[PDB]
């Protein structure tokens, strides 16, 4: 999934082609501060999508709730559809 986010950070337009002083002084001061904020934001997003040592601790938050859902009093592989079919077999047979 981080690969699919990094693929759309690979499609980001190059803002370091507009770092010269030709684009500094032709441009509105507020739009230039916005452009520099947009470059700072891309550096934040790219520093945090390539922190791959954090995925191994992100995966430990999906693990306990899933393992407690499998630690069932009926069956590890039970679900709603099998329980519904067994409820018809229990209900539509006699008593």
């Amino acid at each position: 999934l981080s690969n699919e986010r990094y693929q759309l950070l690979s499609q980001w337009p190059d803002f370091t082609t507009m770092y010269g002083k030709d684009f500094y002084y032709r441009a509105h001061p507020e739009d230039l501060k916005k452009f520099y904020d947009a470059a700072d934001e891309y550096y934040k997003l790219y520093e945090t999508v390539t922190e791959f040592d954090s995925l191994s601790a992100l995966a430990s938050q999906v693990v306990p709730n899933y393992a407690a859902r499998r630690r069932s009093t009926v069956h590890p592989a039970i679900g709603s559809t099998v329980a519904d079919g067994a409820f018809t077999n229990f209900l539509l047979s006699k008593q």
Binding site: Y19, K21, Y24, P29, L32, A39, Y46, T50, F52, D53
Partner: peptide, 26 residues
């Protein structure tokens, strides 16, 4: 001189410090 202008080596040092993590993991 309203905004402190962006140095050109800032792109290099930032993307190098992040592609070092891309190198490390992958």
């Amino acid at each position: 001189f309203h905004t402190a202008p962006k140095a050109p080596v800032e792109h290099l040092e930032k993307m190098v410090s992040a592609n070092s993590k891309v190198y490390d993991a992958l």
